[PDB]
Amino acid sequence: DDSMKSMNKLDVIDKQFQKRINGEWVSTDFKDMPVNENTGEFKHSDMVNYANKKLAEIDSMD
């Protein structure tokens, strides 16, 4: 269940960060991330998860 929820919530966190990079202001705080009923509640740990997984992914890209 956690793996499924984490997949969804890193997905939505990626959406928020992609919005931020384009320039528009996004809060990027775990409390105000939109819950999708597939995501569940946002802890503080998934911000760290998203950052680490994104950095590893950027390294993995060819």
Binding site: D11, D14, Q18, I21
Partner: peptide, 17 residues
Amino acid sequence: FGGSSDETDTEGTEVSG
């Protein structure tokens, strides 16, 4: 030489989904 290198494009972040 013969080839002319293409001048840089600003890098942006994209994801399929």
